[PDB]
Coordinates of C-alpha atoms (C1' of nucleotides) and ligand atoms in Angstrom, one line a residue:
Chain A
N72 CA 102.0 116.3 75.0
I73 CA 100.4 115.5 77.7
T74 CA 98.9 117.8 80.0
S75 CA 96.7 118.9 82.6
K76 CA 93.4 118.8 81.0
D77 CA 94.0 115.6 79.2
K78 CA 95.4 114.0 81.5
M79 CA 92.1 114.8 83.6
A80 CA 90.6 113.7 80.5
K81 CA 91.8 110.2 80.4
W82 CA 91.2 110.0 83.9
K83 CA 87.5 110.5 84.1
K84 CA 86.8 108.6 81.6
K85 CA 88.0 105.3 83.0
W86 CA 87.7 106.2 86.9
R87 CA 84.4 108.9 87.7
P88 CA 81.0 106.8 87.6
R89 CA 79.2 107.2 84.8
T90 CA 75.7 108.6 83.8
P91 CA 72.3 106.7 83.6
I92 CA 71.4 106.8 80.1
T93 CA 67.5 107.0 81.3
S94 CA 65.9 108.4 84.5
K95 CA 64.4 106.3 87.0
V96 CA 62.7 109.8 88.7
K97 CA 59.0 109.5 88.3
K98 CA 58.0 112.4 90.1
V99 CA 58.6 115.9 88.4
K100 CA 60.7 117.5 90.5
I101 CA 62.1 121.6 90.4
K102 CA 64.9 122.0 88.6
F103 CA 67.1 125.7 89.1
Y104 CA 69.7 126.8 86.9
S105 CA 73.0 124.9 87.3
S106 CA 75.1 128.1 87.5
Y107 CA 73.3 129.1 90.9
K108 CA 75.0 126.2 92.9
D109 CA 79.4 126.9 93.0
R110 CA 78.5 130.2 93.4
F111 CA 75.8 131.6 95.5
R112 CA 75.0 130.1 99.2
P113 CA 72.1 130.8 101.1
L114 CA 72.4 132.6 104.8
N115 CA 69.7 132.0 107.5
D116 CA 69.3 135.7 107.7
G117 CA 67.2 135.5 104.6
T118 CA 70.2 137.6 102.4
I119 CA 72.1 135.1 99.9
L120 CA 75.8 135.6 100.5
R121 CA 78.0 136.0 97.0
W122 CA 81.4 136.7 96.3
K123 CA 82.6 139.8 94.2
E124 CA 84.6 139.4 90.6
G125 CA 87.8 140.9 89.6
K126 CA 90.3 138.9 91.4
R127 CA 90.9 136.4 88.7
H128 CA 93.6 138.3 86.9
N129 CA 94.4 142.2 85.9
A130 CA 95.6 143.2 89.2
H131 CA 98.3 145.7 87.7
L132 CA 94.3 147.5 86.8
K133 CA 93.1 148.2 89.6
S134 CA 93.9 151.2 92.9
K135 CA 95.0 150.0 96.1
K136 CA 91.4 150.7 97.7
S137 CA 90.0 149.0 95.2
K138 CA 91.8 145.5 95.3
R139 CA 91.6 145.5 99.6
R140 CA 87.6 146.3 98.1
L141 CA 87.5 143.5 96.1
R142 CA 88.3 140.7 98.9
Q143 CA 85.3 141.5 101.2
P144 CA 82.5 139.2 100.9
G145 CA 79.2 140.7 99.6
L146 CA 75.4 140.2 99.0
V147 CA 73.2 139.5 96.6
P148 CA 71.1 142.3 95.1
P149 CA 67.0 142.0 96.2
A150 CA 65.2 142.0 92.7
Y151 CA 67.9 138.8 91.3
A152 CA 67.6 137.3 94.6
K153 CA 63.5 137.0 94.7
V154 CA 64.0 134.6 91.4
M155 CA 66.1 132.5 93.3
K156 CA 63.9 132.2 96.5
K157 CA 60.9 131.4 93.9
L158 CA 63.1 128.7 91.7
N159 CA 63.9 127.1 94.9
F160 CA 67.9 127.7 95.7
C161 CA 66.7 128.9 99.5
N162 CA 64.8 125.7 99.5
Chain B
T456 CA 90.2 66.4 133.7
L457 CA 86.7 66.2 131.8
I458 CA 87.1 70.0 131.2
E459 CA 90.5 70.2 130.4
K460 CA 90.1 67.9 127.9
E461 CA 87.5 69.2 126.2
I462 CA 85.8 66.2 125.8
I463 CA 81.7 68.3 125.9
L464 CA 82.7 70.3 123.0
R465 CA 83.4 67.2 120.7
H466 CA 81.1 66.6 117.0
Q467 CA 81.5 62.8 117.1
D468 CA 81.4 61.4 120.4
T469 CA 77.7 60.7 120.7
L470 CA 76.6 60.1 124.5
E471 CA 76.2 63.6 126.4
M472 CA 76.4 64.4 129.6
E473 CA 73.3 63.5 131.6
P474 CA 71.5 66.0 134.0
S475 CA 72.1 64.4 137.0
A476 CA 75.9 64.9 136.0
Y477 CA 75.5 68.2 136.7
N478 CA 72.4 69.2 138.4
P479 CA 74.0 68.5 142.0
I480 CA 77.8 68.9 141.5
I481 CA 76.7 72.9 139.9
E482 CA 75.0 73.3 143.4
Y483 CA 77.1 72.1 145.7
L484 CA 79.6 74.5 143.9
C485 CA 77.9 77.6 143.5
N486 CA 76.5 77.0 147.6
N487 CA 79.8 75.5 149.0
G488 CA 82.4 77.1 147.4
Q489 CA 83.9 78.6 144.0
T490 CA 81.3 79.5 141.0
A491 CA 84.0 80.4 138.1
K492 CA 84.4 77.2 137.1
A493 CA 80.7 76.1 137.9
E494 CA 79.8 78.7 135.5
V495 CA 82.5 77.8 133.2
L496 CA 81.2 74.3 133.0
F497 CA 77.7 75.2 132.3
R498 CA 78.4 77.6 129.7
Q499 CA 80.0 75.4 128.0
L500 CA 77.2 72.8 128.0
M501 CA 74.8 75.7 126.3
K502 CA 77.5 75.2 123.3
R503 CA 76.1 71.6 122.9
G504 CA 72.5 71.1 124.5
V505 CA 72.0 72.6 128.2
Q506 CA 69.5 75.6 129.3
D507 CA 68.5 73.9 132.5
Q508 CA 66.9 76.5 134.7
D509 CA 67.9 74.8 138.2
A510 CA 71.7 75.0 137.5
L511 CA 71.3 78.9 136.2
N512 CA 69.3 79.4 139.2
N513 CA 71.9 78.1 141.4
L514 CA 74.8 79.7 139.4
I515 CA 72.6 83.0 140.5
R516 CA 72.7 82.6 144.3
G517 CA 76.3 81.5 144.1
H518 CA 77.7 84.3 142.2
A519 CA 75.6 86.7 144.7
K520 CA 76.7 85.1 148.0
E521 CA 80.5 84.8 146.8
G522 CA 80.2 88.9 146.4
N523 CA 80.2 88.8 142.6
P524 CA 76.5 90.5 141.5
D525 CA 77.3 91.6 138.1
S526 CA 77.6 87.6 137.1
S527 CA 74.3 87.3 138.6
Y528 CA 72.7 90.3 136.6
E529 CA 75.0 89.0 133.6
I530 CA 73.6 85.5 133.7
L531 CA 70.3 87.1 134.1
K532 CA 70.8 88.8 130.8
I533 CA 71.6 85.3 129.4
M534 CA 68.3 83.8 130.9
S535 CA 66.7 87.1 129.2
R536 CA 68.2 86.7 125.9
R537 CA 67.8 82.9 126.0
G538 CA 64.5 83.2 127.3
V539 CA 64.7 81.1 130.0
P540 CA 61.8 82.0 132.6
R541 CA 62.7 84.2 135.8
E542 CA 61.8 84.1 138.6
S543 CA 60.9 86.6 141.4
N544 CA 63.5 85.8 144.5
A545 CA 66.2 86.1 142.3
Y546 CA 66.1 89.6 141.8
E547 CA 65.7 89.8 145.2
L548 CA 69.1 88.3 146.3
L549 CA 70.6 90.5 143.0
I550 CA 69.4 93.4 144.7
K551 CA 70.3 92.5 148.5
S552 CA 74.0 92.0 147.5
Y553 CA 74.3 95.2 145.9
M554 CA 72.8 96.5 148.6
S555 CA 75.6 95.2 150.6
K556 CA 78.4 96.6 148.8
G557 CA 77.2 100.4 148.8
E558 CA 75.9 100.4 144.9
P559 CA 72.1 101.8 145.3
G560 CA 72.2 103.0 142.0
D561 CA 72.9 99.7 140.6
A562 CA 70.1 98.2 143.4
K563 CA 67.9 100.7 141.2
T564 CA 69.1 99.3 137.8
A565 CA 68.3 95.6 139.5
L566 CA 65.0 96.7 140.6
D567 CA 64.1 98.5 137.4
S568 CA 64.8 94.9 135.4
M569 CA 62.5 93.3 138.1
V570 CA 59.6 95.8 137.3
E571 CA 60.3 95.6 133.5
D572 CA 60.4 91.7 133.7
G573 CA 57.1 91.6 135.4
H574 CA 57.4 90.9 139.5
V575 CA 56.4 93.9 142.1
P576 CA 58.4 93.6 145.1
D577 CA 57.6 94.0 148.9
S578 CA 57.7 97.5 150.8
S579 CA 60.3 96.6 153.3
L580 CA 62.6 96.1 150.1
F581 CA 61.3 99.4 148.7
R582 CA 62.1 100.9 152.0
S583 CA 65.6 99.3 152.0
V584 CA 66.0 100.7 148.5
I585 CA 64.4 104.3 149.0
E586 CA 66.5 105.3 152.3
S587 CA 70.2 103.4 151.1
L588 CA 69.3 105.9 147.6
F589 CA 68.8 109.1 150.0
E590 CA 71.6 108.5 152.4
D591 CA 73.3 108.4 149.4
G592 CA 72.3 112.0 148.0
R593 CA 70.8 110.2 145.2
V594 CA 67.6 112.3 146.1
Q595 CA 66.1 111.7 142.0
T596 CA 66.6 108.3 141.9
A597 CA 64.6 107.9 145.0
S598 CA 62.0 109.8 143.7
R599 CA 61.7 107.2 140.7
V600 CA 61.7 104.7 142.6
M601 CA 58.5 106.6 144.6
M602 CA 56.5 107.4 141.0
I603 CA 56.7 103.4 140.8
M604 CA 55.7 102.9 144.6
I605 CA 52.6 105.1 144.1
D606 CA 51.9 103.2 140.3
Chain C
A60 CA 19.6 123.6 114.8
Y61 CA 19.8 122.3 118.1
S62 CA 22.7 120.4 117.4
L63 CA 21.6 119.3 115.0
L64 CA 24.6 117.9 112.2
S65 CA 22.4 117.5 108.9
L66 CA 23.8 118.1 105.3
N67 CA 21.1 120.7 104.7
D68 CA 22.9 123.7 106.5
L69 CA 27.0 122.9 107.0
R70 CA 29.2 125.6 105.8
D71 CA 33.0 126.7 106.0
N72 CA 34.3 129.4 108.7
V73 CA 34.3 132.2 105.7
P74 CA 32.5 131.6 102.2
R75 CA 34.5 130.0 99.2
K76 CA 36.5 132.1 96.9
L77 CA 36.7 130.9 93.6
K78 CA 38.5 130.9 90.3
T79 CA 38.8 133.8 88.4
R80 CA 37.8 132.3 85.2
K81 CA 40.1 134.8 82.6
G82 CA 37.8 135.7 79.1
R83 CA 34.7 136.0 79.8
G84 CA 33.0 139.5 79.4
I85 CA 33.3 143.1 79.8
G86 CA 32.1 143.3 83.3
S87 CA 34.2 140.4 84.8
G88 CA 37.4 142.9 84.6
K89 CA 39.2 139.8 83.3
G90 CA 38.1 139.4 79.5
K91 CA 39.5 140.5 75.7
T92 CA 43.3 139.6 76.4
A93 CA 43.1 138.0 80.0
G94 CA 45.8 140.3 82.0
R95 CA 48.0 139.4 79.3
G96 CA 48.3 143.3 77.7
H97 CA 48.9 143.7 73.7
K98 CA 50.6 141.9 71.6
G99 CA 54.8 140.7 72.6
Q100 CA 56.2 137.9 73.8
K101 CA 54.5 137.8 77.2
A102 CA 51.6 137.9 75.8
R103 CA 51.7 135.0 73.4
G104 CA 53.5 133.4 76.7
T105 CA 56.6 131.7 75.4
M106 CA 58.9 133.5 77.9
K107 CA 61.2 132.1 80.3
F108 CA 61.4 132.9 83.9
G109 CA 64.6 134.1 85.0
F110 CA 65.5 135.5 81.8
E111 CA 67.8 138.9 81.5
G112 CA 67.6 140.0 77.8
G113 CA 70.5 139.0 76.4
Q114 CA 73.0 141.2 78.8
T115 CA 75.2 138.4 81.0
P116 CA 73.3 137.6 83.8
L117 CA 74.4 138.3 87.2
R118 CA 74.7 134.0 87.8
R119 CA 77.8 133.8 85.2
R120 CA 79.4 137.4 86.2
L121 CA 80.7 136.3 89.8
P122 CA 83.4 133.6 90.5
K123 CA 82.8 130.3 91.5
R124 CA 84.5 129.3 95.4
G125 CA 85.5 126.7 97.1
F126 CA 85.5 122.8 96.8
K127 CA 82.5 120.6 98.2
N128 CA 84.0 118.1 101.3
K129 CA 82.2 114.6 101.4
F130 CA 83.5 113.3 104.6
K131 CA 82.0 116.4 106.3
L132 CA 80.5 115.1 109.6
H133 CA 77.6 117.0 111.1
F134 CA 77.2 117.1 115.6
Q135 CA 74.0 118.4 116.9
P136 CA 74.2 121.1 119.6
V137 CA 72.6 120.5 123.1
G138 CA 73.3 123.6 125.1
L139 CA 73.7 123.0 129.4
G140 CA 70.5 125.4 129.6
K141 CA 67.9 122.8 128.1
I142 CA 70.0 120.1 130.0
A143 CA 69.6 121.9 133.6
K144 CA 65.8 123.0 132.6
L145 CA 65.4 118.8 132.0
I146 CA 67.1 118.2 135.4
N147 CA 64.8 120.7 136.9
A148 CA 61.7 118.5 135.6
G149 CA 62.8 115.6 136.9
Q150 CA 63.0 113.9 133.5
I151 CA 67.1 113.0 133.0
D152 CA 68.1 111.8 136.3
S153 CA 71.0 113.5 137.9
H154 CA 73.3 111.3 139.3
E155 CA 73.8 108.7 136.3
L156 CA 75.4 109.4 133.0
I157 CA 74.6 111.6 131.1
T158 CA 74.9 109.5 127.2
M159 CA 73.7 110.8 124.3
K160 CA 70.9 107.9 124.5
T161 CA 69.6 109.7 127.8
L162 CA 69.4 113.1 125.3
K163 CA 67.7 111.3 122.4
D164 CA 65.3 109.4 124.6
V165 CA 64.0 112.9 126.8
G166 CA 64.1 115.1 123.6
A167 CA 67.4 117.2 123.6
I168 CA 68.2 115.9 120.8
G169 CA 65.9 115.6 117.3
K170 CA 64.9 113.0 115.4
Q171 CA 67.6 112.4 113.2
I172 CA 70.7 112.7 115.1
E173 CA 73.8 112.4 112.2
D174 CA 77.4 111.8 113.9
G175 CA 77.1 113.0 117.8
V176 CA 76.3 115.7 120.2
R177 CA 77.7 118.9 120.4
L178 CA 78.1 120.2 124.3
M179 CA 77.4 124.0 124.0
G180 CA 77.9 126.8 126.6
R181 CA 74.3 128.2 126.3
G182 CA 72.1 128.6 129.7
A183 CA 75.4 128.0 131.5
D184 CA 74.6 130.1 134.6
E185 CA 71.9 127.5 135.3
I186 CA 74.4 124.4 136.4
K187 CA 74.8 123.9 140.2
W188 CA 76.1 119.9 140.4
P189 CA 78.6 117.7 139.4
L190 CA 77.1 116.3 135.9
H191 CA 79.4 113.5 134.3
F192 CA 78.4 114.0 130.5
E193 CA 79.5 111.2 127.6
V194 CA 79.2 113.5 124.0
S195 CA 81.2 113.7 120.9
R196 CA 82.1 117.4 121.3
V197 CA 82.2 119.9 123.7
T198 CA 83.3 123.4 123.6
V199 CA 85.9 125.4 125.9
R200 CA 83.3 127.4 128.0
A201 CA 81.0 123.9 128.7
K202 CA 84.1 121.7 129.9
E203 CA 85.1 124.8 132.0
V204 CA 81.7 125.4 133.5
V205 CA 81.1 122.0 134.1
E206 CA 84.6 121.1 135.8
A207 CA 84.1 124.2 137.9
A208 CA 81.1 122.5 139.6
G209 CA 82.9 119.6 140.1
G210 CA 81.7 117.1 136.8
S211 CA 83.7 115.9 134.0
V212 CA 83.2 115.8 130.5
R213 CA 84.8 112.7 128.1
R214 CA 84.7 112.9 124.6
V215 CA 83.8 109.5 122.9
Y216 CA 83.7 107.8 119.7
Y217 CA 80.9 105.5 117.4
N218 CA 81.0 105.6 114.2
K219 CA 77.9 105.2 111.8
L220 CA 76.9 101.7 113.1
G221 CA 78.0 101.9 116.2
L222 CA 75.7 105.1 116.9
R223 CA 72.8 103.3 115.5
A224 CA 73.3 100.0 117.7
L225 CA 73.7 102.7 121.0
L226 CA 70.3 104.1 120.1
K227 CA 68.5 101.7 118.7
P228 CA 69.4 98.4 120.5
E229 CA 65.8 96.6 119.3
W230 CA 66.4 97.1 115.3
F231 CA 68.9 94.8 115.5
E232 CA 67.2 91.9 117.9
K233 CA 64.0 92.5 114.7
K234 CA 66.0 91.6 112.2
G235 CA 68.0 89.2 113.9
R236 CA 71.5 90.2 113.6
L237 CA 73.9 90.0 116.7
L238 CA 75.0 93.2 118.6
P239 CA 77.8 94.8 117.1
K240 CA 81.2 95.6 118.0
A241 CA 82.5 99.3 118.9
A242 CA 85.0 100.1 116.5
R243 CA 88.3 101.9 116.8
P244 CA 88.8 105.6 115.5
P245 CA 90.5 106.3 112.9
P246 CA 94.2 107.9 112.8
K247 CA 93.3 111.3 111.5
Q248 CA 90.0 111.0 114.1
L249 CA 92.3 109.7 116.9
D250 CA 93.2 113.0 118.6
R251 CA 89.8 114.4 119.2
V252 CA 88.5 111.6 121.0
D253 CA 89.5 110.3 124.9
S254 CA 88.4 106.0 124.5
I255 CA 86.3 104.1 122.6
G256 CA 82.2 104.2 123.4
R257 CA 81.0 101.0 125.0
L258 CA 77.9 99.5 122.7
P259 CA 75.4 98.8 125.9
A260 CA 74.4 102.0 127.4
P261 CA 76.9 103.0 130.5
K262 CA 75.7 104.3 133.6
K263 CA 78.7 104.4 135.5
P264 CA 81.7 107.5 135.0
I265 CA 85.1 106.6 134.7
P266 CA 87.0 109.5 136.0
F267 CA 89.7 110.6 134.6
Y268 CA 92.8 110.7 136.5
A269 CA 91.7 108.6 139.7
Chain D
rG1 C1' 65.5 124.0 73.9
rA2 C1' 70.7 126.5 73.7
rA3 C1' 66.4 133.2 72.6
rA4 C1' 71.6 132.8 66.2
rC5 C1' 75.1 127.7 66.0
rA6 C1' 79.0 124.1 65.2
rU7 C1' 80.6 119.9 71.2
rC8 C1' 75.8 119.2 73.8
rU9 C1' 70.0 118.2 73.9
rA10 C1' 65.3 116.5 71.4
rA11 C1' 67.2 110.6 71.6
rG12 C1' 69.2 105.3 72.1
rU13 C1' 63.3 108.5 70.9
rA14 C1' 60.4 107.9 66.1
rG15 C1' 60.9 104.5 62.1
rC16 C1' 63.0 100.0 59.4
rU17 C1' 64.2 94.8 60.1
rA18 C1' 65.1 89.5 62.8
rA19 C1' 63.8 85.7 66.5
rA20 C1' 61.5 83.5 71.2
rG21 C1' 58.0 82.5 74.9
rG22 C1' 53.2 82.9 77.6
rA23 C1' 55.6 85.8 80.1
rA24 C1' 61.2 87.1 78.1
rG25 C1' 65.0 88.7 80.9
rG26 C1' 67.9 88.8 85.1
rG27 C1' 69.4 85.4 89.3
rA28 C1' 72.3 83.1 93.8
rA29 C1' 79.1 87.4 94.2
rA30 C1' 86.1 87.2 90.9
rU31 C1' 79.1 91.6 95.1
rC32 C1' 79.0 96.3 98.5
rA33 C1' 81.0 98.5 102.9
rA34 C1' 84.8 100.3 106.3
rC35 C1' 88.6 97.5 110.5
rC36 C1' 82.1 97.9 112.7
rG37 C1' 79.9 95.0 109.3
rA38 C1' 76.2 93.2 105.3
rG39 C1' 74.5 88.8 102.6
rA40 C1' 70.8 86.1 94.6
rC41 C1' 67.4 88.3 91.0
rC42 C1' 63.5 92.1 89.3
rC43 C1' 59.4 95.7 90.9
rC44 C1' 57.7 100.1 94.5
rG45 C1' 58.7 104.0 98.5
rU46 C1' 63.1 107.4 100.5
rU47 C1' 67.7 109.4 100.2
rA48 C1' 67.5 113.6 96.3
rG49 C1' 66.8 117.2 92.0
rU50 C1' 72.3 115.5 96.2
rA51 C1' 76.9 113.6 94.4
rG52 C1' 78.5 113.5 89.4
rC53 C1' 79.1 114.9 84.1
rG54 C1' 78.1 119.5 81.5
rG55 C1' 80.8 125.3 75.0
rC56 C1' 81.1 123.7 83.7
rG57 C1' 76.3 126.9 79.7
rA58 C1' 71.5 125.0 78.5
rG59 C1' 70.9 120.6 80.5
rC60 C1' 71.5 115.1 81.7
rG61 C1' 71.5 112.7 86.4
rA62 C1' 73.0 107.5 90.0
rG63 C1' 74.9 104.0 93.5
rA64 C1' 75.5 101.9 98.7
rG65 C1' 72.6 102.2 102.9
rC66 C1' 66.9 102.2 104.9
rG67 C1' 61.0 101.1 104.1
rG68 C1' 57.7 97.1 101.5
rA69 C1' 56.5 92.9 97.4
rU70 C1' 58.2 87.7 96.6
rU71 C1' 61.1 85.0 100.6
rU72 C1' 64.4 79.2 98.2
rG73 C1' 68.1 77.3 96.6
rG74 C1' 69.6 73.0 94.2
rG75 C1' 74.6 70.7 91.0
rA76 C1' 79.6 69.8 91.0
rU77 C1' 80.4 68.1 96.5
rU78 C1' 83.7 64.5 100.3
rU79 C1' 85.3 59.4 101.7
rG80 C1' 84.2 55.4 105.3
rA81 C1' 89.6 55.7 104.2
Chain E
rG1 C1' 34.3 126.8 69.8
rA2 C1' 39.7 129.2 73.3
rG3 C1' 43.5 130.2 81.1
rG4 C1' 42.6 124.0 81.8
rA5 C1' 45.5 118.7 84.4
rA6 C1' 49.0 116.3 87.2
rA7 C1' 53.9 117.3 90.2
rU8 C1' 57.3 120.3 92.9
rG9 C1' 58.2 126.1 94.5
rG10 C1' 56.8 131.5 95.9
rG11 C1' 52.9 133.9 98.9
rA12 C1' 47.3 135.0 100.9
rA13 C1' 43.1 133.5 103.7
rG14 C1' 40.9 129.7 106.9
rA15 C1' 41.8 125.2 110.2
rG16 C1' 44.1 120.5 113.1
rC17 C1' 48.1 119.7 116.7
rG18 C1' 51.8 121.3 120.4
rG19 C1' 56.9 119.6 118.0
rC20 C1' 54.4 118.5 113.5
rU21 C1' 53.4 114.8 109.3
rU22 C1' 53.5 110.4 106.7
rA23 C1' 55.5 107.2 101.0
rA24 C1' 55.1 102.5 99.2
rG25 C1' 53.1 99.0 102.0
rC26 C1' 48.9 95.8 104.5
rC27 C1' 44.1 94.5 107.2
rA28 C1' 39.0 95.5 105.4
rU29 C1' 35.6 97.5 102.0
rU30 C1' 27.2 99.3 102.3
rA31 C1' 33.5 102.2 105.2
rG32 C1' 37.2 103.2 107.3
rG33 C1' 42.0 102.0 110.2
rU34 C1' 47.0 101.1 110.6
rG35 C1' 51.8 101.5 107.9
rU36 C1' 58.8 105.9 111.4
rA37 C1' 61.4 104.4 106.6
rG38 C1' 61.7 109.5 105.2
rG39 C1' 60.4 115.4 105.3
rC40 C1' 60.6 120.4 108.1
rG41 C1' 61.8 122.3 113.1
rC42 C1' 64.1 122.7 118.0
rU43 C1' 69.4 123.9 116.2
rU44 C1' 74.6 127.5 117.1
rU45 C1' 74.5 132.1 113.3
rC46 C1' 81.4 132.9 111.1
rC47 C1' 83.8 129.8 107.5
rA48 C1' 86.8 127.6 100.9
rA49 C1' 87.7 123.5 104.0
rA50 C1' 89.7 122.9 109.0
rG51 C1' 88.1 124.8 112.8
rG52 C1' 85.6 127.7 116.3
rU53 C1' 80.6 129.1 119.3
rG54 C1' 77.9 133.7 126.4
rG55 C1' 70.4 134.8 122.9
rA56 C1' 66.8 138.4 126.7
rA57 C1' 65.4 139.5 131.0
rU58 C1' 66.9 140.8 136.2
rC59 C1' 63.0 140.0 139.6
rU60 C1' 56.6 134.9 140.2
rU61 C1' 61.2 135.1 133.7
rC62 C1' 60.3 135.1 127.9
rU63 C1' 62.9 131.8 124.5
rA64 C1' 60.1 126.8 117.3
rG65 C1' 56.4 125.9 114.8
rU66 C1' 54.3 121.5 110.9
rU67 C1' 50.6 119.1 108.3
rC68 C1' 46.1 120.1 105.5
rU69 C1' 42.0 123.5 102.2
rU70 C1' 40.6 127.0 99.4
rC71 C1' 42.7 130.7 96.3
rC72 C1' 46.8 133.8 92.5
rU73 C1' 51.8 133.4 90.4
rA74 C1' 56.6 130.1 88.5
rU75 C1' 58.9 125.6 86.6
rU76 C1' 58.5 120.8 83.3
rU77 C1' 55.1 118.4 80.4
rG78 C1' 51.3 120.6 73.3
rA79 C1' 50.6 124.7 78.3
rC80 C1' 45.0 130.0 76.6
rC81 C1' 43.6 128.9 70.8
Ligands
K701 K1 65.2 130.0 68.6
K702 K1 68.7 130.1 61.8
K703 K1 51.6 125.4 97.6
K704 K1 49.3 126.9 112.4
MG705 MG1 70.4 110.6 78.6
MG706 MG1 40.4 147.1 83.2
MG707 MG1 35.1 141.5 72.3
MG708 MG1 48.6 139.9 84.4
MG709 MG1 53.0 142.9 77.0
MG710 MG1 45.0 141.6 69.9
MG711 MG1 53.6 147.4 70.5
MG712 MG1 67.9 126.9 68.9
MG713 MG1 71.4 110.3 74.2
MG714 MG1 61.8 101.8 69.0
MG715 MG1 53.0 82.3 72.1
MG716 MG1 60.0 83.0 84.2
MG717 MG1 85.0 89.9 108.9
MG718 MG1 65.6 95.7 102.1

RNA sequence: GAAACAUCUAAGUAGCUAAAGGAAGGGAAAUCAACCGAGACCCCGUUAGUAGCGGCGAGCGAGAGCGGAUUUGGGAUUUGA
RNA sequence: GAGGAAAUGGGAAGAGCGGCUUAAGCCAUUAGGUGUAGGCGCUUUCCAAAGGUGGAAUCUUCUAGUUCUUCCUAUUUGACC
């Protein structure tokens, strides 16, 4: 019928501003991957903060200790943090 | 009965008030009584055609000697924004009016405005303000006066 | 060479390091495959940095989190220690009101104020005088330390245009605009402040219950 | 290109066609802001690879404000009655 | 006859200043000088967001960086041929 997905589609087509067809920026700037943005946050330490996986569903699969453990935020491993450091994620 | 009938602020009227119609009466009102309706009439005269310095100087002295030096300071601010040339003797009465009511910080503010306008005062006034700042516990303002008197 | 500056003997502090021209003979050490090894994709130069080999990457196996607040307010933090040091340096007048304009002119505030000044409690053991402040926010330790010496802190409200008119009043007179008027706080910001700021910079404080 | 591919990208690009001028187009708010205010239109810098869009993947990517260049508004339109 | 150019990032060596530095532009070119808009730091550390925020040392106190040049690499462009 009228669910939240098509309600949001009808709302976004009419009220959200539209992307320009062509660019205006003449300078070339570096862009990293768009999947970094909502998932990672750089700290002033120099390490990058992340959140652990497995908390979306399937909570009957996990032990109590693992359920308590996945609540705790963690850090990106170094070999993967160097890539986003080199691709201008930490500014 | 002229000012309550807003005759000055009428556009279709042609004959305006002569300079001699307000030049002595502002002097008399400021020197021998109240300054408030004098400044009300002259602020109405600004809204049509008048920026005479004589009535402004007399309003400054009248507001100083009445007992409200804030009005003298704001009229000097009006002169500064309108570009009216500012004298040295006007700030002396403002400084000593601040002095007489026990506000040496306001006196130092007015002294700074006088110096930024470009008038050097005398060492007698310097000696008055430095002792008044020191005896009120405001040591650092007195030291800031000392800086410019050294310079 | 007695103070001689000729164009025949100019040289730098260290000798210039030149380019590594790859692909020349055997003796240069970087010829015949340069530095690329033998065959593959990294020798043909068609490899993108950050690719992981077909495994699902770490940037896609981890969950997203949270939302972005577009109305977030940023206040510049000043500690009591810097203000006390500048008091002892004779650059801030201790007997007048300490506004935000005073801090911006002395340089305790950086180049870009954004939404106001937050007063911090660092170096609180250097405060020996009754000081009067007018900031945007203040922490519990800073307010306690100031009022234990006998001063007062007033949390005061400016908006963006009011902050521009407080800090740069010459910017309006170069543009030909009149000085604006201080706006009232919005109802979500009403509880966070005490009073509306005066747009000329005030130099006499206002006691609370006096 | 997405290490395949179908929404997406390449891209309103290449190409084909029509009309007009030395320039064309746009233009003086049924415009932005936020209870404080700005004041037509086009071009250059910054905001900013940020907000936003997106098999929320690969990718695409503003506006307002602020600093410059040019600086311009005219008409309906005013009324003695 | 085949590792090269620009712009933006990660670093190393050298230098300027002590907060550092301009972009478009403007005034002159037998040639430079100006231009504060902006960027980074000081700065405050957790946090989805609201919210919240005592560095060290005791003994004349320590408490920050930024902009260029050269070279090695990365991204976008045909990208060693
Ligand atoms: K392929
Ligand atoms: K295929
Ligand atoms: K570089
Ligand atoms: K350095
Ligand atoms: Mg497009
Ligand atoms: Mg070898
Ligand atoms: Mg060979
Ligand atoms: Mg190699
Ligand atoms: Mg290989
Ligand atoms: Mg081979
Ligand atoms: Mg092989
Ligand atoms: Mg493909
Ligand atoms: Mg398209
Ligand atoms: Mg075409
Ligand atoms: Mg023609
Ligand atoms: Mg034309
Ligand atoms: Mg209005
Ligand atoms: Mg403009």
